[PDB]
Design an enzyme around this catalytic site. Structure first.
Site, mmCIF file in Angstrom:
data_model
loop_
_atom_site.group_PDB
_atom_site.id
_atom_site.type_symbol
_atom_site.label_atom_id
_atom_site.label_comp_id
_atom_site.label_asym_id
_atom_site.label_seq_id
_atom_site.Cartn_x
_atom_site.Cartn_y
_atom_site.Cartn_z
ATOM 1 C CD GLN A 262 32.891 7.711 92.385
ATOM 2 O OE1 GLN A 262 33.588 7.217 93.268
ATOM 3 N NE2 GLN A 262 31.717 8.283 92.634
ATOM 4 C CG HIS B 96 25.167 14.549 61.632
ATOM 5 N ND1 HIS B 96 24.103 14.622 60.757
ATOM 6 C CD2 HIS B 96 25.927 15.647 61.390
ATOM 7 C CE1 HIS B 96 24.225 15.710 60.013
ATOM 8 N NE2 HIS B 96 25.321 16.351 60.379
ATOM 9 C CD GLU B 97 28.128 17.055 64.313
ATOM 10 O OE1 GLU B 97 28.842 17.472 63.373
ATOM 11 O OE2 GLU B 97 26.938 17.405 64.462
ATOM 12 C CG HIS C 197 30.007 16.167 58.837
ATOM 13 N ND1 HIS C 197 29.501 16.325 57.562
ATOM 14 C CD2 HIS C 197 29.061 16.656 59.679
ATOM 15 C CE1 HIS C 197 28.302 16.882 57.636
ATOM 16 N NE2 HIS C 197 28.016 17.106 58.907
ATOM 17 C CE1 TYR D 278 28.068 20.102 55.385
ATOM 18 C CE2 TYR D 278 28.215 22.425 55.970
ATOM 19 C CZ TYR D 278 27.697 21.169 56.193
ATOM 20 O OH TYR D 278 26.821 20.993 57.238
ATOM 21 C CD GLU E 157 24.564 18.278 57.117
ATOM 22 O OE1 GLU E 157 23.659 17.822 57.853
ATOM 23 O OE2 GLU E 157 25.731 18.472 57.526
ATOM 24 C CG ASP F 72 10.172 18.646 68.770
ATOM 25 O OD1 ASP F 72 10.633 17.946 69.701
ATOM 26 O OD2 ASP F 72 10.351 19.883 68.693
ATOM 27 C CG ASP G 100 21.790 25.194 55.525
ATOM 28 O OD1 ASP G 100 22.800 25.002 56.235
ATOM 29 O OD2 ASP G 100 20.973 24.291 55.251
ATOM 30 C CG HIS H 129 22.105 21.611 57.718
ATOM 31 N ND1 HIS H 129 22.998 22.650 57.557
ATOM 32 C CD2 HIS H 129 22.748 20.669 58.448
ATOM 33 C CE1 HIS H 129 24.133 22.346 58.164
ATOM 34 N NE2 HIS H 129 24.010 21.146 58.705
#
Ligand code: 2G9
Ligand code: CA
Ligand code: CA
Ligand code: CA
Ligand code: CA
Ligand code: ZN
Length: 316
Positions: free
Chosen positions: A61, A142-143, A146, A157, A166, A200, A226, A231
């Site tokens: 649990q 998203h992860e 990759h 990247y 991305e 947002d 970046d 991104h």
């Protein structure tokens, strides 16, 4: 670990109850044997050593506050696996049912999540910019995407290839969110971003400029922050993808939408058959056009719409 497959129950980051696939051997572990060669979720215990320890629980649990990020990382990894298998006939990130590993409670106040070359890693956020990031299905997908990219196109990247990398993660993150069909949208990270601010998100695919990200090639970032704006410039490709699916008129250029499923087919084919580690935006356009041609024919609406969308964002 060796054990028998079991089904636990718990609550995720947003307070929703769900069943999770576990494995029993003395403890109940977050090890789902029902998918490929397993989905495994680990406790990083607020530290940065990885993966940490395979998540163990005495009673199957998972309703403690500390459990919530693990529940969601584990469950949403399963949904993402199902999307790739059922929609694209792809078995895990490597196409050969590689074990999928995630660690939660990474570091302290950590406002990010990532693929480290071998596994997914989720911060808890600082409670201001993020809550625990595995609470977002788009984030988890998203992860994992990759990893898919790294095993396929291998987009470097940085700069344009990195912005494509991305965008691919945002696109498939969103398509997985629609696949699960719980409050789906074309925004990124809305479920875990800024708990004190409603409405947002971290990025928008439908209107990247609402958060200052470019929605046209003429507005691309060319500085060094970046990794050359991976991104940031992703907004240009995210907007093109949104237009291919949903349609619209953008900087005066009208795009006829062809829907999510066809967007996914076109971009999955581009990612796995045409893109290379050094592909730039122009080469992505060519890859998408060729992919749509393969799938739907040179004279198809689908091909015409891909061209319109890239025209609309200034990519030739
Ligand atoms: C622009 C700020 C945000 C938080 C950047 N991160 C993101 O947009 C997303 C998470 C979102 C979907 C919630 N995480 P990500 O996977 O893109 C972070 N990327 C990143 O850490 O790469 C760097 C890296 C890490 C490990 C090995 C090699 C390279
Ligand atoms: Ca328990
Ligand atoms: Ca949503
Ligand atoms: Ca979303
Ligand atoms: Ca918010
Ligand atoms: Zn990313």
């Amino acid at each position: 670990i060796t054990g028998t497959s079991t089904v636990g129950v718990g609550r995720g980051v947003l307070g929703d109850q769900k069943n999770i696939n576990t494995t029993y051997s003395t403890y109940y572990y977050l090890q789902d044997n029902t998918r490929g060669n397993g989905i495994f979720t680990y406790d990083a215990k607020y530290r940065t050593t990885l993966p940490g320890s395979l998540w163990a629980d005495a009673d199957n649990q998972f309703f403690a506050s500390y459990d919530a990020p693990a529940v969601d990382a584990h469950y949403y990894a399963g949904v993402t696996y199902d999307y790739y298998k059922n929609v694209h006939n792809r078995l895990s990130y490597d196409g050969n049912n590689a074990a999928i590993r995630s660690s939660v409670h990474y570091s302290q106040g950590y406002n990010n999540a990532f693929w480290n070359g071998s596994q997914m890693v989720y911060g808890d956020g600082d409670g201001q910019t993020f809550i625990p990031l595995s609470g977002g299905i788009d984030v988890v997908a998203h992860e994992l995407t990759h990893a898919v990219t790294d095993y396929t196109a291998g987009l470097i990247y940085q700069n344009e290839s990195g912005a494509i990398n991305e965008a691919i993660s945002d696109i498939f993150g969103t398509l997985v969110e629609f696949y699960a069909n719980k409050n789906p949208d074309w925004e990124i990270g809305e479920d875990v971003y800024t708990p004190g601010i409603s409405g947002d998100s971290l990025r928008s695919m439908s209107d990247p400029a609402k958060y200052g990200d470019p929605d046209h090639y003429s507005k691309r970032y060319t500085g060094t922050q970046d990794n050359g704006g991976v991104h940031i410039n992703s907004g240009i490709i995210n907007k093109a993808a949104y237009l291919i699916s949903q349609g619209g008129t953008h900087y005066g250029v009208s795009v006829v939408g062809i829907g999510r499923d066809k967007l996914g087919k076109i971009f999955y084919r581009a990612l796995t058959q045409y893109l290379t580690p050094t592909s730039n935006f122009s080469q992505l356009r060519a890859a998408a056009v060729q992919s749509a041609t393969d799938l739907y024919g040179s004279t198809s609406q689908e091909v015409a719409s891909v061209k319109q969308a890239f025209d609309a964002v200034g990519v030739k």
